[PDB]
């Protein structure tokens, strides 16, 4: 009973479990003296060539900026994942408020890479 032009419902989308384990990835970043929580600033992370992880709220605004990050598509290397929880993203990044768009910078020759690289594949699987 469905064959019309429905909405994307902010996809892809990760279950409550996937988001739980993924969330920890954000807090872990701060432990490596690395962290990011800003839509306008996020444009720099990608422009610098270190945007491997990106987390944004399905209902986070301004949205016009959330779509500015991606130039072409996943083919052009553009990580992104929606989560049904902002209160968590605000504390994960390290701020006393709901973050709009945050990202995690990857470090070269780092032990964390062994983990970030593994979980990274998770996002790609949903990207395409």
From Swiss-Prot:
* Pfam families named in the record: Ribosomal_L7Ae
User: Which Gene Ontology cellular component annotation is one that this UniProt entry carries?
Assistant: nucleoplasm
Family per UniProt?
Belongs to the eukaryotic ribosomal protein eL8 family.
Q: How does it assemble?
A: Identified in the spliceosome B complex. Component of the U4/U6-U5 tri-snRNP complex composed of the U4, U6 and U5 snRNAs and at least PRPF3, PRPF4, PRPF6, PRPF8, PRPF31, SNRNP200, TXNL4A, WDR57, SNRNP40, DDX23, CD2BP2, PPIH, NHP2L1, EFTUD2, SART1 and USP39. Interacts with RAD17 and PRPF31. The complex formed by SNU13 and PRPF31 binds U4 snRNA. The complex formed by SNU13 and PRPF31 also binds U4atac snRNA, a characteristic component of specific, less abundant spliceosomal complexes.
Organism whose genome encodes this protein = Homo sapiens (Human)
Q: Which PANTHER family match?
A: RIBOSOMAL PROTEIN L7AE FAMILY MEMBER
Q: What is this protein called?
A: NHP2-like protein 1
Keywords noted in UniProt: Acetylation, mRNA processing, mRNA splicing, Nucleus, Phosphoprotein, Ribonucleoprotein, RNA-binding, Spliceosome
| Source superkingdom | Eukaryota
Identify the main location.
nucleus
Outcome, altering residue 57 to F? Abolishes U4 snRNA-binding
Tell where it localizes.
Nucleus; Nucleus, Nucleolus
Question: So what does mutating residue 80 to A actually do?
Answer: Reduces U4 snRNA-binding by about 50%
Please give the biological process terms from Gene Ontology that the record holds: box C/D snoRNP assembly; maturation of SSU-rRNA; mRNA splicing, via spliceosome; ribosomal small subunit biogenesis; single fertilization
- Chain spans, region Interaction with U4 snRNA and U4atac snRNA: 36-48
Residues modified as N6-acetyllysine are 21
Q: Using the record's annotations, give every residue carrying the modification N-acetylmethionine.
A: 1
Q: Give the Phosphoserine positions (modified residues).
A: 122
């Amino acid at each position: 009973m469905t064959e019309a032009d429905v909405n994307p419902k902010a996809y892809p989308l990760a279950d409550a479990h996937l988001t739980k384990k993924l969330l920890d990835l954000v807090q872990q970043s701060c432990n490596y003296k690395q962290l990011r929580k800003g839509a306008n600033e996020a444009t720099k992370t990608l422009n610098r060539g270190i945007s491997e992880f990106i987390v944004m709220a399905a209902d986070a605004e301004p949205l016009e900026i959330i779509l500015h990050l991606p130039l072409l598509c996943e083919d052009k290397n553009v990580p992104y994942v929606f989560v049904r929880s902002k209160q968590a993203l605000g504390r994960a990044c390290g701020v006393s408020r709901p973050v709009i768009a945050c990202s995690v910078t990857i470090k070269e020759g780092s032990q964390l890479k062994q983990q970030i690289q593994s979980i990274q594949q998770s996002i790609e699987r949903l990207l395409v």
